[PDB]
Structure formats: structure tokens, C-alpha cells
Amino acid sequence: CSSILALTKVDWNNNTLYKKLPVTLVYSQVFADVVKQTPEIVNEIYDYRFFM
Amino acid sequence: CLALDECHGVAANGNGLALADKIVQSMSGLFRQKHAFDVLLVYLPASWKKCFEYDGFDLHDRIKAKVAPLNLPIQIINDTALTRQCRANVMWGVSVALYAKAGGIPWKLADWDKDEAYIGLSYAIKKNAEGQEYTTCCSQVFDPDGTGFEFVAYDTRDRKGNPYLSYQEMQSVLSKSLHLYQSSHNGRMPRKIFIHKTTHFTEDEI
Amino acid sequence: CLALDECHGVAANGNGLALADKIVQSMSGLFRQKHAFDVLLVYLPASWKKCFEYDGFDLHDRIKAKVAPLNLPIQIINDTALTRQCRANVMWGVSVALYAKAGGI
Amino acid sequence: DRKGNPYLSYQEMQSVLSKSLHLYQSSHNGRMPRKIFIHKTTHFTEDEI
Amino acid sequence: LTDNEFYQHYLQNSQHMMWFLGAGTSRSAGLPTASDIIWDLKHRYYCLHENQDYQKHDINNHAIKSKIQSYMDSKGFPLQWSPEEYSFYFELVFRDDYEAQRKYLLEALASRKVSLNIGHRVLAALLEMNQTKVVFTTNFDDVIETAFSDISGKHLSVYHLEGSYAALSALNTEAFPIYAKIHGDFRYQKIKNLTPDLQTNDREIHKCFLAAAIRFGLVVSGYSGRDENVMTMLRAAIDQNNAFPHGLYWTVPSISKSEPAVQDLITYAQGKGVRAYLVETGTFDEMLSKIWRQVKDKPAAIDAKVRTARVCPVSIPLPGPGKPALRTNALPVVTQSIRCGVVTLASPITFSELKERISQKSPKALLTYTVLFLGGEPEIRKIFSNDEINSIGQYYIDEIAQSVAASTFLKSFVEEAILTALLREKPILHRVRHRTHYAVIPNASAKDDRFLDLRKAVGFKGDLGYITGNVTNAKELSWAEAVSIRLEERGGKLWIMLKPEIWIKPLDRREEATDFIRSRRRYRFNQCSYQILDAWIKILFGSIGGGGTVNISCFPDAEFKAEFEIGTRTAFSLGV
Amino acid sequence: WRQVKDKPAAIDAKVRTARVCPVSIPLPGPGKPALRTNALPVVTQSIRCGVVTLASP
Amino acid sequence: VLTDNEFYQHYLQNSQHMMWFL
RNA sequence: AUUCCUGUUAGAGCUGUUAAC
DNA sequence: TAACAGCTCTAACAGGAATA
RNA sequence: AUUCCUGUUAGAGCUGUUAAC
DNA sequence: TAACAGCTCTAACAGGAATA
């Protein structure tokens, strides 16, 4: 509970106090959209600063 | 830089892929001068809204997917940022986004444990003509032995019709995550690993 | 990565502190990909000799102390690996240093 | 904070030595070290010993 | 009140001095403090309710501490380092089970982690050697019961709440030293540690504090207030005729961080007529170290345990030379006793003044200050007139090695004397660089037969070498072979150190020939260096290094003459 | 054993408390700014009902 | 009677001397 | 797309219970 | 494999701005 | 600064020994 | 606290390459 609560506060893309989900979930969703649009990304891992 | 003129023309054609590729070629003048600038500010006018969002295509998603392998951050700006009322809200947003995209860390979790890695798996829908496609990707928010902290996502991969990773795929993505964590902490095991999935874990997946 | 051209101006100005700060600030392009690499080979041209070592300062120690909390190992290379006739020296000193900084023991 | 001589004071040596064997215990699941070698470039004063 | 005046004040009257050690002193003994106990309790409880591995995560980590404190705050518990927390967490973990609470407090403060430091040992020495008679310390674990017992070697009468009336009887019958724990040993059920128990005082102990108040003055250290019962006992204790006869200095490690209750308490005493003073003396350990330093005529038997570093350890003997043997450059000076001359001055003199008088007069004698002179009296008469000279007598140095080791002036004087003796009758020139003496082959007499062996030493492939000359690429620099000769005091012996060097005629222009000095010394390997050292031994002594005991005297024609004898063979030792 | 301290590495490698598949962590006690949820408890542990038998699926 | 958690606390606190009958 | 996730409209995937093939 | 029930989530739009 | 420690030029730090203050 | 003695260290430079 504390881990998730703290994780919902380190989304730099978000300019509000917190989120509904931990940053892990929201960034996994964002990268899921990115990969679904573009299949030729599956090989490499990417930092958060690129897709945030 | 200036957006090349034909983009405007393809705005009439309603071809999202062509518009994204033309924007990438417009920014191609900035490929050589990567050292000079840190963050690019791509602006998409409201006149391009026809190609902003439509079935099976996302303009910002495609643009960032094309630009990420080239290793240059963009903070796409639309009319919205210059369309609201409260200026301080947008200014905080853009300022923090630009500072973090440059390479800085606006803030970090206070007294965060460096020996715990928090994995998070999510998925997305691609509406195939015959069936459906489930794209599952993972993310990590661990804190390395240094002072800064890391946040990296990657695909879980050939074809999936259900969002539940099998034994092989889940074992593979978790081994890749373990190697990623090892690379930062000189090779130390993560004492405890937290996994946040949007759906329930299968018996084989556990 | 490529060092900023402002580093040359600072070196001509003879300011060691600002030169070390600029070298560290040049590392952001790699820091966006800190997971990608293990060891960073920072090279210093001879034209920066004026700031390599003078009183109350040492560039190597400043760089090491600035990048130590950032967890990235750094193998500083001076024109010494270029010249260096016993040039299989370089391959062992540099190679053993590289292995130790990427992994260890 | 500042030191005028390279000879650590009795409190400083006790603190440094405490940090040292605490590090060893953390790396040895709490087991006490049995032999300790403290090499110094200068002579130990009475306070250090 | 400044700390030094307090030390003089105590040293002035330490015979009549109660001590009041709080839980702060035990902080160093290695025992967990109050905060450490609190953090151990939270961590012990937090892991059990929330099933987490106990040893997987430590307690002094910043992240784990923050996580545990956040968990504690989640259940509405007190926030941070606030009153009624320590007792609160004790009563929470142990749910009013005083036996289990006692057992845990015993285990945490047990007598196996305690390592006595200088403070407790010094206090125990003060107890044994009978300056302080009463030590009331609000602690628990026996850091002192142990430490005074170890240094004195005699058992200590500890008083507690189990009896609690022993202190008054022992005080009344003068059964000193007494060590009354106001909160009692943990072996005994009365521990008095929770806040509800900390509001009351035992009648008989409280009675003792007041009777002991009149007899002695109080020094309280490692105590930060926060206790109502002890504060009110002291206030009651303060409220009596001559409550503290010598005054009470509440010592704190830092006056700025002292609680207002103390300063309030100190101001309160002063209004009641007592001379109570609050001082800062740093930590308890440093305070007691200084106090012991100012102690006079401390018995050797107990001081051998108070300061174990004061006695000399590691007197590990060396084996015999029995059974390849390295041949060093040390010539043993077997001379044990020498004679010197002393002049008495009507006015005090400075070693610098004598050095400048040497520089001006340039006499044919040696002098040093301690004024010991070696040479002829008329030379001293040239240096010093009859008006400034009171008498001239003799001095005997029975143990030369101990004398040079004790005083560096003697070391320099004897080194100069032996150097003058060794170069007295020989053509080799004597120079100095920094404070090292050099015997150098002279330029003119380089063709002497006594140098020919040296000429063999430097020769290449057995031919004739060169001893003196000019640098290959220097305008005026001249070079010669030389030996740096020094005096080394090793244990209880004196040795002469010889090191082959390349002397350069201009003193300040030595660096310009560095490459040459390097180039000439590139191939001076073990055989070549052995040859050069043998040649230099022959030159300096006149005899080869086999079974020789050549004796050399400086100023043989002088009334005050020093006669040294140095073995001609350098130090050697066969391998075991 | 999960709260016993100072255990050698070999023993922990040997036992490792196996693995916990059916996670079941105890609910605390009722306790005592308590929040009011919208859930109404149903205490009817069993009910009676009817069955009809069909000659065809 | 006593809660299992306080029994665990007693057991861990003094585990060096306690039997086990099965 | 500075952001936040509240609604609406739909569909899919998981489980189950039947009918079978 | 074809229905049925529930749980849950994403896909596309639309949409106002934090006790009034 | 791939390394190594050989020297040069200086200053401190400790010990002391006096003269004090 | 001011000199003086020794023992030992680092602080800046310079500097060439394993018995020939």
C-alpha cells in the first residue's frame, strides 16, 4: 500500500498532486500504446524521459 | 526548424503515417545537431486535428515511437497548452516536463529503498481485421546505487490474443527485468520485487 | 556523446571548476540511456592541459567526485593512451580497469 | 569538521572504527571480526590507540 | 562558567563530589541508547504484525526507518521523537508484561556488547582511589559496575530499588564507594522505566539524595532532564542548607542544545543560594579524560588499567641470527659512554644565539645547548669571554643511545661529532645539504690510491671508472662520488647510515644534472652497489669489513675529546 | 522462522520457506475517523428454492 | 487464551530455551 | 498532445454452467 | 465450439478545472 | 589522468629542549 | 607562544621504462 501510494507521486508528466495508478502502471500503459502503434520497438528498452 | 510544406498538403489527405514520416523528415535537419539542443518542441496545429486521432492510429504516439530510436526527446505542444485559462498550471507542466526531458530529476521519492524494484505490466488493444491483438509491456521504477533513480519500460516479447503472459514470456520479461536491475546495482539481487498487473495472475504466470 | 564547445572556452579561460562542471553536464545524453552502457570513456584533449592540475584543484578528482553519486563508472583517458609506445600496456592497464569498473574483481 | 593535524581524536577514531566494524558486520551477517589491521602513514597517538 | 575554570574547581575539590551519570554516557559504552531501543522495538513489532523477514532489512537504514515510522504513524501512534513515546512503545510491544519487558531490556543492554571506554574506566578509578564516593546514575546496564571492577580488581556495591534502603545505611555508616541506581538493575523486577513509573520516587532513595546533598557537591553528566521525578528530587535536593557545598555544575555536551528545564533548573538553584553552575565540556568521555589527566599521584596499578595504551605493548622479541643474508648500510657504534665539556653562562642563552655565534666566530670546536661543548677550552674562550663564562666543567653521557633518543639536540650534536671524527684525518671533503652530512671525494686529490678501489667500483665491465668530473651537458656544474652519512637510533643501539650519492658542486644547481644523476645511477645494481659500499667503507674506515673494531676520536689533541668505536662490518643477518 | 535473526546463508538457501501460493494475510481486529462504506451485510446464510425436472435438455 | 501474535513474540524473544512436543 | 480521469457509447478477454461435437 | 451469467479492461469520444 | 615511484623544489605536522608569558 | 633539533608526510613538478 505504501509502495503504490508513493509510486503515484513521481509522474513528472503529471502536473497535479498525484495519480490514480502507480507510475509503473501508467508508463506501462503508455509504452503499450507506443508499441501497439509501432511494432518495430520490441527489441530495445527505453527510458521514461522519452515517452513522458 | 520549420515544418516542411508538404505536411500541410498531406493534412488534406488524412494520412497519419505519411504526416508522421513527413514530420520526422522535417526534424531530420536536427539529426546532425543533436549536441546543440536537448529538447525539441514539436507543435501540431489544430488544422492537423483530422490526423490527430483516428481508428488504429495515434499521431503523438506514432511521432514519439519514430523519434525515440533516434534518441532526442520531444515535448509535443498543441493548441491546448495555448488554449486553456490558467497559465500557471500549464507553465508548471511544461517547465517540469522540459527539465525532466533534458536529463534532470525534478523530485525523487524520499527515503526510497534502493533494494526494491517495482515492476508494472500493462496492455493495449489493436483492433485487427480478423481478431484482436494484445500488446503487453513492462516498466521498472527501481532506484540504483547512485542518487538518481531509473524508470524504464520495454515490450514483453510473437502474437497474443489474450493479455495473460504464458510461462515462457513472463519468465523472459522478468529475467530481462532482473538483468536490468543487476546492471545498475553492480550485480546485487533485488531483495523484494513488486509486480502491478491490471488483470489477475494466472496459475502458470505466478 | 560530444562535449560542449563551451568546454573549450572555459579551458582557454583557465577555470578548472567550470570545466569539470561542463564535462559533467555533457553527460546528460548518456544519462537518458544510463542503462545502455556500463563504463564511460571520458577523453580530454591536450588543449585542456591548463586546467588539468593547478593549485587548490585537480580536474580528475573533481570529475570522479561529481560522477560518483551518479553511479556511472568513468575511465578517464589522456593523450597518454594515444602516444604510449609500449602500446600493449594500454591494452592491459586500460582493459583491467575497464573490467573492474564494469562488474568487478 | 576541520582538522588541523592528521592524527584523529579519540572520538573520531572511535566513530571511524565503529563505522568500519558495522560495515563488516553488515557484510558478515553480524559476525564479529577477529583480526583488525589499522595501517596508518603516521604514528598513532595515545588517543588513537 | 568556562570549562577550564570548572576543571580547576573540581581538581581543587574532587574529594567531596557525587556524580550523577544519566543514560547519555552509556551511549558510548556501545549499549543502545533510548532512541536505539525505540527503533529496535518499532522494528521488532512492525515485522511481526506485517509479516516481513526480520534480518532481510536492517534498522539503521534511512529507507527502512522511514517506512517503519510511516507504518507506526498509520495506526495513529505518536509521530516522532516526542515525550510519552518510549514508554508507549514498550507498553505496546509488551502489553503490560513486566517480566518479558525486563527480559528484553536485559537482553538489549546485556553484559556482552559492553566495551568499557576511557570515561567509565576513569570514573571507576576515581571511585577506587577514593575521590568520588557516591555515583547515582539513572542508567541500567552495568557499564561502571564492570569497568571499576576491572581496573580496581575489587567488587563494587551496587544499590537499586530491590532493597533501596541500603544506600541510606551505607551513606550513614560511610561504606564508600556507593553506586546507587535510582532506577535499579534490570536483573531485579523493579526497573522504573516506563513513564507512569517515572513520576514517583522511592522514599528511601529520595531520602538518600537529600542526605548526600549536604555531604558532597554534585556533578551531573550525560543527563538532559525530561524526567519529572529526578528533577523534583533535585529541586527538593536543592532546597536544603548547603545542598551542594562545592556547587553543582550541570555539564552538557552542548550548552545551545540543552533543554530549558536544566537552564531553568540551574537558574532556580542560584536563587536558592547555592553556587550551581552549568558548563559545557564536550562529551562525557573527553570530560573524564581531562579530569583524569589533571589527577595527581594516580596509583600505577590502577592506571595500568585506566589507560591501557599508556603501557607499551607489542614488545615482541626478535630471534637469533641462526642459519642468503642481506647486508645493510648500518655500521654499529658500540660506544656507550662519552665525555663532553659544559660552560655555565651568567645570562640565559638560546640555541639560535649559539648557532649564530658559531656562524660568526667559526671556532675549531663543537657546541650545542641542553651548553655542551666538544673540543678545546680556548676555542670556547674565543666564542665566550670571561665575563659571560661562570665555570667550565665536565659532563658524562653514560647511555648515549637513550640520550640521543630523549633529546634531538643530543642527536644532532653526536651526529656532528661522529662526522667530524670520521673526516678528521682524511682528504675526503665534508659538506652539508639540508641537514644531511656528505663525505665527498675532493676534486683535486681524485687521483689518490685510496680512491682507486672506488675507481674500480664505478668501472664498467671491470675497467677503470671515474670518480670526479664535470657534467656532460652542464655549463659549470661539477660532480663527484659521495656518501650521505647519518646517525640512526634503533631501539637501544646507534648506527651509522651510509648511502652512496652523486654530489654536485653547486648546491642550488643540483636539479640541472638530474638526468646525469639518473644516467650515472641507471645500472648501479646489487653487485655494483655492493662494490661501491665496500669501497666507501674502506675509504671511511681504512679497514675491510671483516672482524674489525676501528676506533676514531675527534679532536685527539684537545682536553675534551670524544672517542667513538664503530664496527667496520655493516649489519647482516642470515635467513631462518 | 521468518522473524528469527542471524541465520547462516546455507540454512536460508536450504529452507527459503518454500513459496506461498495461497496468500492469506490476517485481517486486523475491528479497531476504533472511521469511514462509512455503502455495503449492507447479508446474514441469510441459506435459502430454500424450487427445482423443476425436464424431460428434454 | 492468547493471540497467536503475542505467542510469537514470546517465542522469538526467548527461543534459545523452549521445547517442542509433536 | 502541459495535465487530471469523470462520464458516455461499444467490444473483447478471462473465468464459470449447460449443450454437444 | 455455441450460448448463457459475472468481472474487468480498453477503444473512442466529450469535457470541465478542485467546498461552490 | 592505462600505470609505476625515482628525484627536485618547498611547507607543514608531530614530538621534543630551552626561554618565556 | 617563540625559536631551535630530528622524523615523516604531502604538495607541485619532471620524468623514463625493468642487468643493460
Ligand SMILES: [Mg+2]
Ligand atoms: Mg508530456
